């Protein structure tokens, strides 16, 4: 009978000192999911507002359906938050990313109550992050949910999980799947009814035990394994609470029965055969809406995704929404989850990294997608470690190890770190993050260094957990590093993909990033407040050429595309044309005349073709085609260029 | 049948937890309060004091409470923040480290041995003030930590940590006409409230019955004896109970004081009409050793040598004090300036905190009849010239406090270099600017000009010195510069200050920065480092500093003598001058038994001449008092007395 109501239809201000005593008149009205960031946080100058905000709605007990206790469920509130029912401050958090709650029957008694919300993203000492290349979007940019439970309720007080903890173990073509539930004001005179469920929904396995034993172990015969997506199947277990034979509460996750390993020369292997893991990160944020995205913004992203093929997603920096970790189980993609732990170690932050860390792992345990915990990203860019440093991270690897016996911690480096620094050999496996052919050197000496690396250290596994070079809408026929033009991030990934692409040694590359996305800090490029080092615009709107690239090396999707498209008035006679394809023949037309048949190692088919008047090129793969076209002229068309 | 139950003794404290502990720690450091985790490394220097977040954890047994409707935890001084857990339950926070505050939590004592743990903090942050000031953040729980058992119905306890009762006399001639109005929770319709007022000597002077729903009264006391300073700290005490039947189940009361003033802007401070000079010293709230925790006899030492030297007012800078200490103030007849940790830099988002903490020190000191003003903020503007958001922070909190105090007057203390002409000192009724000409560059002699420019420029705002001083540690010369940090010119330093200040009428007070040395471990300078020395007491109050004694010369009637350079013994000249400080008319000096001539000093800075030769005996006589010092001449100067 555990219901849950939607609660997101709210006033809101900036300029509050104090809680409200009754409900504000003259506020601004919103429907969360919400931020106050959207505009001043993407735009630049690092102007955005970082401070305390409030939210006002009444909850009228009238319109509730009547439980022994109400809850109050806070998907994201960036970064802390307050809450007061009708005045009385009931419960504070730390981190803008994890879901917490709070039982609120007591103070519900009014008729008409009034929840007050304070949210800041502030400046201090305690509170992650404090110092990464992405804005603090502030508010209650995920839903806020009301939960009315029976007396007797699985968990809703620890650290904001599910109440119920999956873990599948393989035996040969079987798997033992442990239930454990947590109760809430159990009667020992309560049963727990156990049911693991089929992808079509068919019962598969059910058992019966008391309350008192929160555990159990269900067989599940000849299980479809999770194979990712070859086969990301997906089971269902089922836990009810039953008093006399009415179930009172129920809770219930999907999960997936998968293996995999981390070999340091091998890569990633997933259900015993190698899985090359190569994909992207991901932040999530869209252009004008800051960070309240909307269900079909994640259905979106996701889609972009796989249509790109990427197989493996780093879900930076931080704990991501629920329902994006559903899609990436349902699509079968390799997940590398992690908390703000990043740039600068705060002493006084030791708490916060224990606290969200826990929230990651107690919330997300029941992810199959999921298969490393990421401690902290380029934590030493201050400088090398400190005992604080490495005690910190040493407590948080062996809780997440004590915590969760079947997946891996991670590290994502600094480039500049010392590949002896003691901090890389606490965790399990590590990533580096290297911009070699952006901040400085050649795209060349990616290649080399991760080889340098696996020579010193050959039994740690080292990923590439980020790589990318900044891209607008500019173009030139001589791209350079510097000149944020299109083809020369296209050329830069050509490059990359290269180098990493033929290591299976690399257990997981991830492109940095997927989508551009907000830093209101930024000023470079000629537009201000983002990271345009994505292979998709802020807005999803325009997939650059390097997204093609990808897609011609992962995708099974049969495509053909031109690049250049938006680079058309060229000086020279002669021009340069590139395909990708993930196809092996493909011939260009220049005005109907054919300049050639190519095929390619690597999916980059580089044509050569005269430059004179007015042409239209034709790339056909064949039954697939694409259309670009070019024109000759006297002198280079400086709005091409960013000057 | 209210009780106040010390709960000082045996706390479990750690800088190493990580969270709030399930069962009581067995091997964390013992501690008794008043306690402070940087009594040690917040006052050697390096600004190393550590910052962070502290865990302090001590049972509650059930059993050995009193019986009574509801138990309340009252915390008179946590540092900086605090959350207060019951059982692992969080059930109360707080910002703002020197305040009172209180939390009701009869519902969570669940078991016979309940276990209390309080989280202190005093980290940084853009939200609790303060963040930057010349000073030490000293953490944790350095004041009292009470339980309270009161009845169901109890005079408020959850309003910004008051005292649930407001005294406010008006004084109509000869008569006072006393306000007196007090604050309930969960009272009944048909309990009465018994107002009486007593006497000096507890005399019922009178007294009114009115039912639970009027929680206001006006009673009347004729041939008042006011509250006059100095003259005459005559205290009355209000006294307010609860009575369901003639049971009283709960009863308050404060000592207050009916007096009358105003702050001239030429004739200066104006106290139940007469003229009443406002000239005196700072004073902080911690000493040498034990950090910010002082016990009561710290606070009562401190003040009696403030009387030793006859201020007549202290600045207790910067932030809310300790109550008891505000009591010996009304005892004594000092007139009090409070003010609140607004300093230095104006952060935006500290705007919630002064608000907070300046409501906190109206409600929790209105009663108190030495206060006259209340200070919103110190050098705020040091970091730049006023702004928007700092200007609407101080109409903010100087309506706030013309709304809930309508006796008393706001200032400010303004940063030295700030512009008279900014727009942040129009916003108070009264200012009062902080000026080191003679120790931060510059030369004393300017004071004087200065003051009487601004007067010139702004004849309608009263204008005071809030900040005066220079640095002394154990330092001697017979050369006195701006720099050598020796006791002597800060000597001649605070003599010319005080015939510049003591002789201008307009300024309305005067307040000698500081009275004591205090704790400031981002401070290096002078020989001893974590320190401001600039005090005329050293800061383990064993050494009064010869400036002391000149303020002592112009403030007290207590008759004495003082030779000044006793520590200065070993000097090279063959002629030497030596200063005597006396509040008498005329002084003899001897040396070697031989008088060496009479001297009036007008500004009673006796300068006289002597020769230096072997080893002199040096003895000021003025009447019936005497004092004694040495001297010898030597041959070079001994490096010893040199900062160098
Ligand atoms: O940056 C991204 O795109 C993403 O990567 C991660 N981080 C990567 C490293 N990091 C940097 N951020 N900004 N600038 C530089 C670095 S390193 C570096 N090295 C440089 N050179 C110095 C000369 O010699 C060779 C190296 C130069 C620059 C930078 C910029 C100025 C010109 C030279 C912080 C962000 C963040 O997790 C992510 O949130 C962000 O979005
Ligand atoms: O300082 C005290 O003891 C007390 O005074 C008040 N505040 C006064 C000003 N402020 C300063 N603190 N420390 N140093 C300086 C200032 S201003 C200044 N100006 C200076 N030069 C400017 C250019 O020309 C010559 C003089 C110099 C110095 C300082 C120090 C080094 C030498 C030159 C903060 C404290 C505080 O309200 C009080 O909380 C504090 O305890
Ligand atoms: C993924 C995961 C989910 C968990 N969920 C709960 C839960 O909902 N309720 C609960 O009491 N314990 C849960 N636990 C475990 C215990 O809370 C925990 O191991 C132990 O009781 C320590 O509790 P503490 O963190 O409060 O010290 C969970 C553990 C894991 C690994
Ligand atoms: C010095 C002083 C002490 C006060 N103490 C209390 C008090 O203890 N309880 C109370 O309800 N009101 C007290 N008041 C007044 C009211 O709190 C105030 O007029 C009004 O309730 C403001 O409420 P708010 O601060 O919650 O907005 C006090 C006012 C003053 C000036």
């Not at 008192?212 to 997506?229: F, R, Y």
């Not at 932050?349 to 990421?374: A, F």
């Not at 490029?525 to 897609?551: C, I, M, P, W």
Request: proline share 4%.
């Amino acid at each position: 009978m555990r219901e849950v109501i939607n609660f997101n239809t709210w006033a809101f201000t900036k300029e509050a000192t104090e809680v409200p005593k009754e409900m504000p008149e003259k506020w601004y009205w919103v429907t969360l999911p919400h931020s106050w960031n959207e505009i001043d946080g993407q735009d630049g100058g690092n102007d955005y507002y970082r401070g305390t905000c409030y939210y006002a709605k009444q909850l009228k007990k009238s319109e509730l359906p009547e439980a022994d206790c109400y809850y109050l469920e806070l998907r994201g509130a960036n970064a802390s938050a307050d809450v007061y029912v009708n005045g009385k401050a009931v419960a504070h958090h730390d981190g803008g990313y994890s879901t917490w709650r709070v039982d609120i029957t007591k103070e519900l008694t009014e008729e008409e109550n009034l929840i007050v919300i304070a949210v800041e993203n502030g400046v201090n000492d305690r509170v992650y992050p404090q110092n990464a290349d992405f804005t603090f979007y502030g508010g209650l940019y995920r839903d806020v949910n009301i939960i009315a439970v029976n007396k007797s309720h699985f968990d809703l007080d620890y650290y904001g999980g599910p109440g119920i903890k999956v873990t599948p173990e393989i035996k040969g073509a079987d798997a033992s799947v442990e239930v454990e539930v947590f109760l809430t004001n159990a009667a020992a005179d309560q049963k727990l009814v156990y049911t693991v469920k089929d992808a079509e929904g068919k019962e598969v396995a059910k058992t019966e035990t008391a309350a008192g034993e929160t555990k159990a172990v269900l067989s599940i015969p000849a299980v479809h394994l999770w194979n990712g997506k070859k086969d990301p199947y997906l089971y269902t277990a089922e836990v009810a609470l039953v008093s006399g034979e009415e179930a009172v509460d129920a809770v219930s996750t999907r999960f997936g029965c998968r293996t995999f390993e981390i070999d340091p020369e091998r890569g990633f292997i997933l259900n015993g055969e190698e899985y090359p893991l190569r994909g992207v990160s991901r932040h999530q944020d869209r252009w004008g809406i800051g960070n309240a995205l909307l269900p079909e913004h994640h259905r979106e992203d996701i889609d972009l995704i796989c249509e790109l093929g990427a197989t493996t997603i780093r879900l930076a920096h931080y704990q991501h929404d629920q329902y994006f970790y559903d899609l990436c189980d349902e699509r079968g993609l390799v997940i590398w989850a992690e908390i703000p732990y990043i740039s600068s170690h705060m002493p006084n932050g030791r708490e916060n990294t224990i606290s969200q860390m826990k929230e990651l792992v107690v919330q997300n345990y029941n992810h199959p997608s999921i298969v490393v915990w990421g401690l902290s990203n380029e934590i030493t860019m201050a400088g090398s470690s400190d005992e604080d440093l490495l005690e910190n991270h040493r407590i948080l690897n062996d809780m997440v190890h004590e915590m969760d016996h079947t997946r891996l911690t991670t590290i994502a480096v600094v480039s500049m770190c010392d590949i002896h620094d003691p901090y890389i050999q606490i965790p399990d496996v590590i990533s580096y993050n290297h911009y070699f052919g952006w901040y400085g050197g050649d795209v060349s000496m990616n290649g080399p260094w991760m080889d340098n690396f696996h020579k010193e250290f050959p039994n740690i596994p080292l990923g590439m957990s980020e790589y990318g070079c900044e891209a607008l809408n500019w173009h030139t026929s001589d791209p350079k590093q510097g000149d944020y033009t299109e083809e020369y991030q296209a050329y830069y990934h050509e490059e990359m993909i290269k180098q990493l692409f033929t290591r299976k040694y690399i257990w997981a590359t991830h492109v940095w990033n997927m989508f551009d996305f907000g830093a209101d800090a930024r000023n470079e490029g000629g537009e201000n407040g983002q990271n345009h080092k994505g292979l998709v615009t802020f807005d999803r709107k325009y997939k650059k050429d390097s997204f093609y690239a990808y897609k011609a090396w992962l995708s099974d999707e049969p495509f053909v595309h031109l690049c250049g498209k938006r680079y058309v008035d060229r000086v020279e006679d002669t021009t340069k044309v590139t395909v990708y394809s993930n196809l092996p023949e493909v011939e260009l037309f220049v005005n109907g005349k054919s300049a050639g048949k190519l095929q390619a190692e690597d999916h980059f088919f580089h044509f050569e073709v005269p430059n004179v008047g007015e042409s239209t090129l034709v790339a056909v793969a064949g039954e697939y085609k694409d259309e670009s076209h070019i024109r000759k002229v006297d002198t280079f068309n400086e709005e091409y260029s960013l000057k």
